[PDB]
Amino acid sequence: KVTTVVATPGQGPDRPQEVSYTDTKVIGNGSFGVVYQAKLCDSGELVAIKKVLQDKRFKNRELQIMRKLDHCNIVRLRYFFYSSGEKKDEVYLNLVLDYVPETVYRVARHYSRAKQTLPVIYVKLYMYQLFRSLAYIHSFGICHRDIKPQNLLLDPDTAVLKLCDFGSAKQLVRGEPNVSYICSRYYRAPELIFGATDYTSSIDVWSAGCVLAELLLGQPIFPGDSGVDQLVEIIKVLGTPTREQIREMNPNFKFPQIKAHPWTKVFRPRTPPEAIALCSRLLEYTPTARLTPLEACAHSFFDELRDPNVKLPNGRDTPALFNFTTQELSSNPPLATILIPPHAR
Ligand SMILES: O=C(Nc1cnccc1-c1ccccc1)c1ccnc(NC(=O)C2CC2)c1
DSSP states (O other): OOEEEEEEESSSSSOOEEEEEEEEEEEEEETTEEEEEEEETTTOOEEEEEEEEOOSSSOOHHHHHHTTOOOTTBOOEEEEEEEOOSTTTOOEEEEEEEOOOEEHHHHHHHHHHTTOOOOHHHHHHHHHHHHHHHHHHHHTTEEOSOOOGGGEEEETTTTEEEEOOOTTOEEOOTTOOOOSOOSOGGGOOHHHHTTOSSOOTHHHHHHHHHHHHHHHHSSOSSOOSSHHHHHHHHHHHHOSOOHHHHHTTOOOOOOOOOOOOOGGGSSOTTOOHHHHHHHHHHSOSSTTTSOOHHHHHTSGGGGGGGOTTOOOTTSOOOOOOOOOOHHHHTTOGGGHHHHSOTTOO
16 A cells, blocks of 8 residues: 655755655566656655665665766665565665656657657757757766667657666776677667777767657668668668778678668658758768867757747647756857857846
């Protein structure tokens, strides 16, 4: 019925509170553990509870990253607490998060299975907000490392996107090596497939680019169940990478010598050229030639979002889009002139 636990608020001072919740049910199972959904008694608010086994040795990295995060496009840690339950005398970490009812995956799938495309204004709204969350976490040196449609939460009434699952997220320091086997199926950057250990935070941007193409195409842009297949699909668009381009990703195989497909010809006829242009500047072999998250926010493809008259198809106003903080703009402070339009309060 009602479950009452003593939970530590995520943000703020470490002062634990009795928190009660009912209607608990399962909404996810995975390598990480299990996610529940329940209703808070004192508010009626829906929450998602992510339950993971707690490493006895070290502190949980996800918890420590999520406790440092505060941004309108990242899912909020409301509380966290510790429980028992299975394994063998082990401790479980429970991350209590704001429940968001939808994901880009489920929504993209509705449209693909209905054979329409997701309206571009949603592509603008969703992609812009993803790039904001990245601008933010990247300013801390934190790379998400598993950006994909299932990790992009959506509230279809407000058009708010929230990035979730920081289970793979890590701070990337120059000269410190990092595992290359992060990141999922269709969204791995070529330098990961090639097994680079010196990759940078632009892998997230490659991934984001894959989401954008997919929202435009109605299907993944680089499918394949092996790296080899994914790589072949990549070369079919970007063309065969050059010696310099290969070096910028890795050592040490020749490839199909196939010339580039004209990016205008990779998408449906009605596709906006600003979107095709933004794709081409995210999906670059050379990981330093890719746009930064903040630069992409400032991209012309998103200009419509900065129009004073724009509204959601449901009639409502657009959600927070311009509350940039100094931290978020740090990559490139002068972009504020473009990012914060005259009407934004
Ligand atoms: O953190 C979350 N999940 C996760 C955390 N870590 C890893 C994976 C997930 C996850 C699990 C299932 C679906 C989407 C994400 C999480 C947080 C808030 N809302 C949702 N909502 C939903 O799942 C919507 C009903 C679809 C998921």
